[PDB]
């Protein structure tokens, strides 16, 4: 009879996409009103599970991911999209039955002169897979030439910095995102 | 594997991402300088700009390493060539420093040139504003003669040798970059290649401009005869009824715009012009309401509304006594979703029209934002200002002013004030077309080397007489350089943009009014509440510069080539009225005349 719904949704240290944070929470069963009192928060897609269907009978385990992203790319934190944050930074499965929650952090994550701490990967010699994480900081070989493990032609640092400044337009402003995966495989409603 | 095209796409991706950040840095620095003139912001602007310049030079080298010969995606190839432009760096470093020294030197001679009246060697007057108001508000032929000759003597004589060497070095620069002269470099803006059905040689610009000017000549002849008549009244013994109009009498120091002469050439003086300024001040109208009405216009045609960044980050009034800021109305696209307008708005009709014009700039910027960074611009050098002018013209129509409430519900037009309106409009619009053509042609032939130097200050006036219809009030030897006395000639700005923009804006407006189902004379059409003209204009605005200028021209006006016919179709009523009022006047002029 205990739940955390303040630790991940109320934290001033959100993680970037290349290191999408994931915290797990079991034996919980918290209600919906705890997560239905935070202003408009853009629009929260809840695939499979219907939003207002929490109650008690539900899933077992849960893996909650959190990161940041410009609002142009929130549509990419969704099944099927092929945008830069998806096929190169963070891919959601096609059978995804979790949920997505997004809001603006221009009030806090963006800083004057640039909060370049928040970043994202743009070059990767391969596509990503569901719930996969890559933290490699290794020069990207792009054209046929044995990259000397160093920066140069066809050899770029795989991570670009967002670097937010509050005056940016809504599209380039810092949205904060949290996805709520779900699984009820051979277990007694771990959460529920 | 890894074909060159894929590698170039990767490079351009890295560029389009880091550039955007640096361009935002420099744009925001420039904005904080122009909204608050403090030395600190000045320094930050210079720093950000020089860093952006170094970034672009380095990336230009790295992009020139890519080969345009083996790239089969034009949307990529255009960005590549645009960044590949090596520029004046091809000149010898010594020659590059000399050229840049000459550019800044002539620009500072212009911006620091003054004429000291012999009345008092202590007292002097600069171009801005002393000489300008002397030449734009006085009627005394002697004083205006003095000012014309004085600014062309103290300043132009200096700018002569520098501009000579300038021709030399710019020719070398363009010959290196594989252009037949610096004029070919300037004409290469309308160059379209590799797209069948839309390509445009760099000399087809010359042919189309000359042929279109041939079609413009008659309206300018009748306007010249009428203006010559009214001025012949003004000055009782100073212009030949068959002679070229004198120079220091045209309205400005160079004669590029005849708009001032309106006060002496109004067809019906008793008929006042339409100015709602008092009506605005008397309806609680604030600059907020001005820009809201602009938003409302662009919304009524279908285009989006200004982002909250504009309604929150833009200076739409004079700040105050404490702050000091630039007030020349400017449209700013800092990128990354940030669009602003800098304007020290006053409750006048001029600022109402200018607000619509600059917000049209802003809407054009918002449309071409989805494109890659290098491809975020106007289709050519005259597309932007043309868009702004079509906004101003749709606004000024008495129909629109009625709709917004700044006009009475039953204000009935009179043909005399439509003649006055069309005549003022033609004094500005039509009057500057021969000037622009003549001056740009002089520069073009000089860069080709057809005009020998010892025959410079000669040929100019010949063209001035044979094309513009203006006589020099004083004989000038080659120790002068009156060309260089213009701001654009000594500050190295291609000129033909204004001629083009004019023809463009009229073609645009006529096509849009067609979509908007307006009937009657073209100067009475308002695109308001018309969604279809908005969609058409947006189909042009979204492309930015990803497709050729001919294609966007077809996307709006429905044709691939420039055509004066919309412009003449706009000014035709005035044309008839001129022909009438000039029945008893000689139409045309004669080279021979000259008050000497």
PDB file of N, CA, C and O in Angstrom, chain B residues 193-245:
ATOM      1  N   UNK B 193      19.716  26.446 -63.593  1.00  0.00           N
ATOM      2  CA  UNK B 193      20.333  25.457 -64.463  1.00  0.00           C
ATOM      3  C   UNK B 193      19.943  24.059 -63.999  1.00  0.00           C
ATOM      4  O   UNK B 193      19.619  23.834 -62.830  1.00  0.00           O
ATOM      5  N   UNK B 194      19.968  23.117 -64.941  1.00  0.00           N
ATOM      6  CA  UNK B 194      19.754  21.718 -64.634  1.00  0.00           C
ATOM      7  C   UNK B 194      18.319  21.306 -64.397  1.00  0.00           C
ATOM      8  O   UNK B 194      18.080  20.162 -63.998  1.00  0.00           O
ATOM      9  N   UNK B 195      17.354  22.194 -64.617  1.00  0.00           N
ATOM     10  CA  UNK B 195      15.940  21.876 -64.466  1.00  0.00           C
ATOM     11  C   UNK B 195      15.266  22.219 -65.788  1.00  0.00           C
ATOM     12  O   UNK B 195      15.043  23.399 -66.086  1.00  0.00           O
ATOM     13  N   UNK B 196      14.944  21.196 -66.576  1.00  0.00           N
ATOM     14  CA  UNK B 196      14.410  21.424 -67.911  1.00  0.00           C
ATOM     15  C   UNK B 196      13.052  22.106 -67.855  1.00  0.00           C
ATOM     16  O   UNK B 196      12.178  21.729 -67.071  1.00  0.00           O
ATOM     17  N   UNK B 197      12.877  23.105 -68.717  1.00  0.00           N
ATOM     18  CA  UNK B 197      11.668  23.890 -68.755  1.00  0.00           C
ATOM     19  C   UNK B 197      11.688  25.124 -67.884  1.00  0.00           C
ATOM     20  O   UNK B 197      10.794  25.968 -68.014  1.00  0.00           O
ATOM     21  N   UNK B 198      12.678  25.263 -67.004  1.00  0.00           N
ATOM     22  CA  UNK B 198      12.732  26.384 -66.082  1.00  0.00           C
ATOM     23  C   UNK B 198      14.106  27.033 -66.002  1.00  0.00           C
ATOM     24  O   UNK B 198      14.282  27.972 -65.220  1.00  0.00           O
ATOM     25  N   UNK B 199      15.076  26.569 -66.785  1.00  0.00           N
ATOM     26  CA  UNK B 199      16.415  27.128 -66.730  1.00  0.00           C
ATOM     27  C   UNK B 199      16.422  28.544 -67.300  1.00  0.00           C
ATOM     28  O   UNK B 199      15.569  28.925 -68.107  1.00  0.00           O
ATOM     29  N   UNK B 200      17.403  29.331 -66.868  1.00  0.00           N
ATOM     30  CA  UNK B 200      17.420  30.754 -67.193  1.00  0.00           C
ATOM     31  C   UNK B 200      18.871  31.199 -67.300  1.00  0.00           C
ATOM     32  O   UNK B 200      19.563  31.294 -66.283  1.00  0.00           O
ATOM     33  N   UNK B 201      19.323  31.470 -68.521  1.00  0.00           N
ATOM     34  CA  UNK B 201      20.691  31.923 -68.724  1.00  0.00           C
ATOM     35  C   UNK B 201      20.917  33.262 -68.031  1.00  0.00           C
ATOM     36  O   UNK B 201      19.979  34.020 -67.769  1.00  0.00           O
ATOM     37  N   UNK B 202      22.181  33.551 -67.722  1.00  0.00           N
ATOM     38  CA  UNK B 202      22.502  34.796 -67.036  1.00  0.00           C
ATOM     39  C   UNK B 202      22.381  36.022 -67.933  1.00  0.00           C
ATOM     40  O   UNK B 202      22.553  37.140 -67.437  1.00  0.00           O
ATOM     41  N   UNK B 203      22.092  35.848 -69.223  1.00  0.00           N
ATOM     42  CA  UNK B 203      21.895  36.966 -70.128  1.00  0.00           C
ATOM     43  C   UNK B 203      20.449  37.113 -70.559  1.00  0.00           C
ATOM     44  O   UNK B 203      20.031  38.157 -71.087  1.00  0.00           O
ATOM     45  N   UNK B 204      19.671  36.049 -70.349  1.00  0.00           N
ATOM     46  CA  UNK B 204      18.232  36.166 -70.531  1.00  0.00           C
ATOM     47  C   UNK B 204      17.657  37.199 -69.575  1.00  0.00           C
ATOM     48  O   UNK B 204      16.640  37.828 -69.881  1.00  0.00           O
ATOM     49  N   UNK B 205      18.308  37.403 -68.425  1.00  0.00           N
ATOM     50  CA  UNK B 205      17.951  38.512 -67.547  1.00  0.00           C
ATOM     51  C   UNK B 205      18.071  39.840 -68.280  1.00  0.00           C
ATOM     52  O   UNK B 205      17.153  40.668 -68.247  1.00  0.00           O
ATOM     53  N   UNK B 206      19.198  40.051 -68.966  1.00  0.00           N
ATOM     54  CA  UNK B 206      19.403  41.288 -69.714  1.00  0.00           C
ATOM     55  C   UNK B 206      18.319  41.454 -70.773  1.00  0.00           C
ATOM     56  O   UNK B 206      17.686  42.513 -70.873  1.00  0.00           O
ATOM     57  N   UNK B 207      18.090  40.410 -71.580  1.00  0.00           N
ATOM     58  CA  UNK B 207      17.091  40.523 -72.645  1.00  0.00           C
ATOM     59  C   UNK B 207      15.700  40.806 -72.095  1.00  0.00           C
ATOM     60  O   UNK B 207      14.978  41.660 -72.623  1.00  0.00           O
ATOM     61  N   UNK B 208      15.284  40.068 -71.065  1.00  0.00           N
ATOM     62  CA  UNK B 208      13.941  40.255 -70.537  1.00  0.00           C
ATOM     63  C   UNK B 208      13.783  41.636 -69.918  1.00  0.00           C
ATOM     64  O   UNK B 208      12.749  42.285 -70.107  1.00  0.00           O
ATOM     65  N   UNK B 209      14.809  42.126 -69.216  1.00  0.00           N
ATOM     66  CA  UNK B 209      14.730  43.463 -68.636  1.00  0.00           C
ATOM     67  C   UNK B 209      14.615  44.516 -69.734  1.00  0.00           C
ATOM     68  O   UNK B 209      13.786  45.429 -69.654  1.00  0.00           O
ATOM     69  N   UNK B 210      15.427  44.394 -70.790  1.00  0.00           N
ATOM     70  CA  UNK B 210      15.385  45.391 -71.859  1.00  0.00           C
ATOM     71  C   UNK B 210      14.050  45.364 -72.592  1.00  0.00           C
ATOM     72  O   UNK B 210      13.462  46.417 -72.864  1.00  0.00           O
ATOM     73  N   UNK B 211      13.555  44.169 -72.917  1.00  0.00           N
ATOM     74  CA  UNK B 211      12.289  44.069 -73.636  1.00  0.00           C
ATOM     75  C   UNK B 211      11.125  44.563 -72.782  1.00  0.00           C
ATOM     76  O   UNK B 211      10.249  45.297 -73.275  1.00  0.00           O
ATOM     77  N   UNK B 212      11.108  44.208 -71.498  1.00  0.00           N
ATOM     78  CA  UNK B 212      10.065  44.711 -70.619  1.00  0.00           C
ATOM     79  C   UNK B 212      10.151  46.228 -70.475  1.00  0.00           C
ATOM     80  O   UNK B 212       9.122  46.911 -70.454  1.00  0.00           O
ATOM     81  N   UNK B 213      11.365  46.783 -70.411  1.00  0.00           N
ATOM     82  CA  UNK B 213      11.496  48.237 -70.347  1.00  0.00           C
ATOM     83  C   UNK B 213      11.005  48.896 -71.630  1.00  0.00           C
ATOM     84  O   UNK B 213      10.459  50.007 -71.594  1.00  0.00           O
ATOM     85  N   UNK B 214      11.226  48.245 -72.775  1.00  0.00           N
ATOM     86  CA  UNK B 214      10.619  48.715 -74.016  1.00  0.00           C
ATOM     87  C   UNK B 214       9.107  48.818 -73.872  1.00  0.00           C
ATOM     88  O   UNK B 214       8.500  49.803 -74.308  1.00  0.00           O
ATOM     89  N   UNK B 215       8.484  47.813 -73.254  1.00  0.00           N
ATOM     90  CA  UNK B 215       7.042  47.915 -73.006  1.00  0.00           C
ATOM     91  C   UNK B 215       6.684  48.964 -71.950  1.00  0.00           C
ATOM     92  O   UNK B 215       5.535  49.418 -71.917  1.00  0.00           O
ATOM     93  N   UNK B 216       7.622  49.342 -71.077  1.00  0.00           N
ATOM     94  CA  UNK B 216       7.307  50.361 -70.068  1.00  0.00           C
ATOM     95  C   UNK B 216       7.445  51.784 -70.617  1.00  0.00           C
ATOM     96  O   UNK B 216       6.784  52.703 -70.119  1.00  0.00           O
ATOM     97  N   UNK B 217       8.288  51.991 -71.630  1.00  0.00           N
ATOM     98  CA  UNK B 217       8.621  53.347 -72.081  1.00  0.00           C
ATOM     99  C   UNK B 217       7.445  54.313 -72.267  1.00  0.00           C
ATOM    100  O   UNK B 217       7.591  55.486 -71.879  1.00  0.00           O
ATOM    101  N   UNK B 218       6.298  53.934 -72.852  1.00  0.00           N
ATOM    102  CA  UNK B 218       5.264  54.957 -73.130  1.00  0.00           C
ATOM    103  C   UNK B 218       4.684  55.632 -71.894  1.00  0.00           C
ATOM    104  O   UNK B 218       4.506  56.866 -71.882  1.00  0.00           O
ATOM    105  N   UNK B 219       4.327  54.847 -70.873  1.00  0.00           N
ATOM    106  CA  UNK B 219       3.812  55.423 -69.635  1.00  0.00           C
ATOM    107  C   UNK B 219       4.807  56.409 -69.042  1.00  0.00           C
ATOM    108  O   UNK B 219       4.421  57.478 -68.550  1.00  0.00           O
ATOM    109  N   UNK B 220       6.100  56.085 -69.117  1.00  0.00           N
ATOM    110  CA  UNK B 220       7.120  56.995 -68.614  1.00  0.00           C
ATOM    111  C   UNK B 220       7.241  58.248 -69.478  1.00  0.00           C
ATOM    112  O   UNK B 220       7.517  59.325 -68.946  1.00  0.00           O
ATOM    113  N   UNK B 221       7.025  58.143 -70.794  1.00  0.00           N
ATOM    114  CA  UNK B 221       7.054  59.343 -71.632  1.00  0.00           C
ATOM    115  C   UNK B 221       5.917  60.295 -71.280  1.00  0.00           C
ATOM    116  O   UNK B 221       6.127  61.508 -71.168  1.00  0.00           O
ATOM    117  N   UNK B 222       4.697  59.773 -71.127  1.00  0.00           N
ATOM    118  CA  UNK B 222       3.596  60.669 -70.768  1.00  0.00           C
ATOM    119  C   UNK B 222       3.742  61.211 -69.349  1.00  0.00           C
ATOM    120  O   UNK B 222       3.414  62.379 -69.092  1.00  0.00           O
ATOM    121  N   UNK B 223       4.242  60.398 -68.414  1.00  0.00           N
ATOM    122  CA  UNK B 223       4.509  60.928 -67.081  1.00  0.00           C
ATOM    123  C   UNK B 223       5.574  62.016 -67.141  1.00  0.00           C
ATOM    124  O   UNK B 223       5.482  63.027 -66.437  1.00  0.00           O
ATOM    125  N   UNK B 224       6.578  61.838 -68.003  1.00  0.00           N
ATOM    126  CA  UNK B 224       7.616  62.845 -68.164  1.00  0.00           C
ATOM    127  C   UNK B 224       7.054  64.140 -68.731  1.00  0.00           C
ATOM    128  O   UNK B 224       7.387  65.222 -68.249  1.00  0.00           O
ATOM    129  N   UNK B 225       6.207  64.049 -69.758  1.00  0.00           N
ATOM    130  CA  UNK B 225       5.606  65.252 -70.334  1.00  0.00           C
ATOM    131  C   UNK B 225       4.754  65.993 -69.308  1.00  0.00           C
ATOM    132  O   UNK B 225       4.845  67.222 -69.184  1.00  0.00           O
ATOM    133  N   UNK B 226       3.936  65.264 -68.548  1.00  0.00           N
ATOM    134  CA  UNK B 226       3.085  65.912 -67.553  1.00  0.00           C
ATOM    135  C   UNK B 226       3.916  66.553 -66.442  1.00  0.00           C
ATOM    136  O   UNK B 226       3.672  67.708 -66.053  1.00  0.00           O
ATOM    137  N   UNK B 227       4.904  65.818 -65.920  1.00  0.00           N
ATOM    138  CA  UNK B 227       5.760  66.346 -64.862  1.00  0.00           C
ATOM    139  C   UNK B 227       6.569  67.525 -65.374  1.00  0.00           C
ATOM    140  O   UNK B 227       6.782  68.512 -64.659  1.00  0.00           O
ATOM    141  N   UNK B 228       7.030  67.443 -66.620  1.00  0.00           N
ATOM    142  CA  UNK B 228       7.731  68.561 -67.223  1.00  0.00           C
ATOM    143  C   UNK B 228       6.830  69.780 -67.306  1.00  0.00           C
ATOM    144  O   UNK B 228       7.273  70.901 -67.057  1.00  0.00           O
ATOM    145  N   UNK B 229       5.553  69.581 -67.633  1.00  0.00           N
ATOM    146  CA  UNK B 229       4.632  70.711 -67.685  1.00  0.00           C
ATOM    147  C   UNK B 229       4.486  71.362 -66.313  1.00  0.00           C
ATOM    148  O   UNK B 229       4.641  72.583 -66.163  1.00  0.00           O
ATOM    149  N   UNK B 230       4.203  70.552 -65.292  1.00  0.00           N
ATOM    150  CA  UNK B 230       3.978  71.116 -63.963  1.00  0.00           C
ATOM    151  C   UNK B 230       5.238  71.800 -63.432  1.00  0.00           C
ATOM    152  O   UNK B 230       5.162  72.859 -62.793  1.00  0.00           O
ATOM    153  N   UNK B 231       6.413  71.225 -63.711  1.00  0.00           N
ATOM    154  CA  UNK B 231       7.664  71.828 -63.257  1.00  0.00           C
ATOM    155  C   UNK B 231       7.985  73.094 -64.039  1.00  0.00           C
ATOM    156  O   UNK B 231       8.518  74.060 -63.479  1.00  0.00           O
ATOM    157  N   UNK B 232       7.675  73.098 -65.339  1.00  0.00           N
ATOM    158  CA  UNK B 232       7.809  74.292 -66.164  1.00  0.00           C
ATOM    159  C   UNK B 232       6.977  75.432 -65.606  1.00  0.00           C
ATOM    160  O   UNK B 232       7.366  76.602 -65.708  1.00  0.00           O
ATOM    161  N   UNK B 233       5.822  75.106 -65.030  1.00  0.00           N
ATOM    162  CA  UNK B 233       5.090  76.098 -64.249  1.00  0.00           C
ATOM    163  C   UNK B 233       5.870  76.496 -63.003  1.00  0.00           C
ATOM    164  O   UNK B 233       6.035  77.691 -62.721  1.00  0.00           O
ATOM    165  N   UNK B 234       6.337  75.505 -62.234  1.00  0.00           N
ATOM    166  CA  UNK B 234       7.066  75.801 -61.003  1.00  0.00           C
ATOM    167  C   UNK B 234       8.238  76.745 -61.271  1.00  0.00           C
ATOM    168  O   UNK B 234       8.325  77.839 -60.700  1.00  0.00           O
ATOM    169  N   UNK B 235       9.148  76.338 -62.155  1.00  0.00           N
ATOM    170  CA  UNK B 235      10.302  77.157 -62.503  1.00  0.00           C
ATOM    171  C   UNK B 235      10.070  77.799 -63.858  1.00  0.00           C
ATOM    172  O   UNK B 235      10.031  77.088 -64.875  1.00  0.00           O
ATOM    173  N   UNK B 236       9.930  79.124 -63.925  1.00  0.00           N
ATOM    174  CA  UNK B 236       9.343  79.745 -65.116  1.00  0.00           C
ATOM    175  C   UNK B 236      10.284  79.815 -66.300  1.00  0.00           C
ATOM    176  O   UNK B 236       9.824  80.087 -67.417  1.00  0.00           O
ATOM    177  N   UNK B 237      11.571  79.563 -66.102  1.00  0.00           N
ATOM    178  CA  UNK B 237      12.548  79.814 -67.144  1.00  0.00           C
ATOM    179  C   UNK B 237      13.714  78.845 -67.027  1.00  0.00           C
ATOM    180  O   UNK B 237      14.869  79.253 -67.159  1.00  0.00           O
ATOM    181  N   UNK B 238      13.431  77.568 -66.764  1.00  0.00           N
ATOM    182  CA  UNK B 238      14.518  76.648 -66.479  1.00  0.00           C
ATOM    183  C   UNK B 238      14.396  75.266 -67.091  1.00  0.00           C
ATOM    184  O   UNK B 238      15.312  74.465 -66.882  1.00  0.00           O
ATOM    185  N   UNK B 239      13.314  74.926 -67.788  1.00  0.00           N
ATOM    186  CA  UNK B 239      13.224  73.651 -68.490  1.00  0.00           C
ATOM    187  C   UNK B 239      12.645  73.889 -69.884  1.00  0.00           C
ATOM    188  O   UNK B 239      11.741  74.713 -70.069  1.00  0.00           O
ATOM    189  N   UNK B 240      13.203  73.184 -70.878  1.00  0.00           N
ATOM    190  CA  UNK B 240      12.718  73.279 -72.250  1.00  0.00           C
ATOM    191  C   UNK B 240      11.478  72.409 -72.395  1.00  0.00           C
ATOM    192  O   UNK B 240      11.508  71.233 -71.999  1.00  0.00           O
ATOM    193  N   UNK B 241      10.375  72.932 -72.952  1.00  0.00           N
ATOM    194  CA  UNK B 241       9.146  72.130 -73.065  1.00  0.00           C
ATOM    195  C   UNK B 241       9.342  70.834 -73.838  1.00  0.00           C
ATOM    196  O   UNK B 241       8.504  69.929 -73.786  1.00  0.00           O
ATOM    197  N   UNK B 242      10.459  70.747 -74.556  1.00  0.00           N
ATOM    198  CA  UNK B 242      10.879  69.542 -75.248  1.00  0.00           C
ATOM    199  C   UNK B 242      12.179  68.989 -74.681  1.00  0.00           C
ATOM    200  O   UNK B 242      12.734  68.035 -75.236  1.00  0.00           O
ATOM    201  N   UNK B 243      12.681  69.564 -73.589  1.00  0.00           N
ATOM    202  CA  UNK B 243      13.971  69.201 -73.055  1.00  0.00           C
ATOM    203  C   UNK B 243      13.896  68.209 -71.911  1.00  0.00           C
ATOM    204  O   UNK B 243      12.852  68.019 -71.295  1.00  0.00           O
ATOM    205  N   UNK B 244      15.029  67.558 -71.652  1.00  0.00           N
ATOM    206  CA  UNK B 244      15.121  66.654 -70.514  1.00  0.00           C
ATOM    207  C   UNK B 244      14.909  67.424 -69.220  1.00  0.00           C
ATOM    208  O   UNK B 244      15.313  68.584 -69.094  1.00  0.00           O
ATOM    209  N   UNK B 245      14.259  66.778 -68.261  1.00  0.00           N
ATOM    210  CA  UNK B 245      14.081  67.393 -66.958  1.00  0.00           C
ATOM    211  C   UNK B 245      15.445  67.605 -66.306  1.00  0.00           C
ATOM    212  O   UNK B 245      16.329  66.750 -66.424  1.00  0.00           O
TER     213      UNK B 245
END
